[PDB]
Amino acid sequence: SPPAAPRFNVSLDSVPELRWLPVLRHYDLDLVRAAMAQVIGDRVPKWVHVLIGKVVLELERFLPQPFTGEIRGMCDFMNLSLADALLVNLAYESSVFATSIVAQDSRGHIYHGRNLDYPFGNVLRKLTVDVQFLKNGQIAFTGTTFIGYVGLWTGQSPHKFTVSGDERDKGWWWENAIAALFRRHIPVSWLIRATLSESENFEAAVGKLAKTPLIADVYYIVGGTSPREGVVITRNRDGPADIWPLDPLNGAWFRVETNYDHWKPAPKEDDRRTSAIKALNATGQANLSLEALFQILSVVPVYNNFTIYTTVMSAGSPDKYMTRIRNP
Ligand SMILES: *[C@@H]1O[C@H](CO)[C@@H](O[C@@H]2O[C@H](CO)[C@@H](O)[C@H](O)[C@H]2NC(C)=O)[C@H](O)[C@H]1NC(C)=O
Ligand SMILES: *[C@@H]1O[C@H](CO)[C@@H](O)[C@H](O)[C@H]1NC(C)=O
Ligand SMILES: [Cl-]
Ligand SMILES: [Cl-]
Ligand SMILES: [Cl-]
Ligand SMILES: [Cl-]
Ligand SMILES: [Cl-]
């Protein structure tokens, strides 16, 4: 059976530059550096590496807190350049594949599950962690991430909402991202974390995730705590291209999103959407549970050779947030 991801706490009462240090000390930084060094060489184009290396300090002015400070803190503790630490944190914003599911059972309770896939040789499975971010000793929100990565592709605000992000690949990622960063747009995984931290309820989270300027396109899957509180937000950098909510009155008790626009067919080369829908159809609304979602997310090719982890969560039952490493 897949093992649960290591769980750690991160205190938001500590300043950004030191928050992650207690967590980093549990890891072999030789492994982390080797992994970060590999990603730069593998995922960052040469012209980007040259450019950011020279202008990182000018770019830092336009980046938001506390993300820069947390990256700066990981710079010093690992003897890595600020440019390289920033680049790795941007490299994982793209080339990440996913399946996200938000669904409503017969009682109107909301369930949320997702797979995250990375199609390159990696040590992400060894660096995946569930993190509880604390304010005054209390859990403000929970997220799943990789050691050294300050954004959240997956997270939960207890008794409020759950969020997962799927990449929306429209090409020219680095060209548009750099220009967007200098215009104070933010990474898609950083917006998820900022939403988990700030938004007071599901409705407010959907608004913030739908409208905040981004450096790239993305799909945001959001689940709430009341019946019908589930939505797929298809984003472009400036705003929402499409808002796709649960619609039980019309028989739509789930929404599936992989990495493609739902109003178009999934590509024949990569049709994880069809498999997920059939498994949900076979499971049935009456049998929907977090465990049932985990089983759906274990069906090939929804579950595939590149799957890093599987997360199931329900904001109404925050204690059930569970991330399991796949293919370990
Ligand atoms: C991670 O943070 C949680 C939340 O603050 C910690 O749980 C608290 O632990 C103290 C001491 O055991 C208790 O007095 C609190 O009531 C606990 N609260 C909850 C909700 O569990 C947890 O101990 C922290 N983990 C570690 C390893 O320190
Ligand atoms: C799912 O079920 C609905 C209703 O039963 C059906 O119309 C649809 O074709 C099914 N889709 C798949 C992929 O099984
Ligand atoms: Cl923000
Ligand atoms: Cl935060
Ligand atoms: Cl309903
Ligand atoms: Cl899709
Ligand atoms: Cl459940």
Curated annotation (Swiss-Prot):
It is a peripheral membrane protein. N-glycosylated. Tunicamycin treatment causes a reduction in specific activity against N-palmitoylethanolamine. Changing residue 117 to A: Loss of autoproteolytic cleavage and loss of enzyme activity. Glycans are attached at residues 9, 79, 281, 305. The record marks 114, 259 as: Important for enzyme activity. Expressed in numerous tissues, with highest levels in liver and kidney, followed by pancreas. Degrades bioactive fatty acid amides to their corresponding acids, with the following preference: N-palmitoylethanolamine > N-myristoylethanolamine > N-lauroylethanolamine = N-stearoylethanolamine > N-arachidonoylethanolamine > N-oleoylethanolamine. Also exhibits weak hydrolytic activity against the ceramides N-lauroylsphingosine and N-palmitoylsphingosine. Heterodimer of an alpha and a beta subunit, produced by autocatalytic cleavage. This is N-acylethanolamine-hydrolyzing acid amidase. It comes from Homo sapiens (Human).
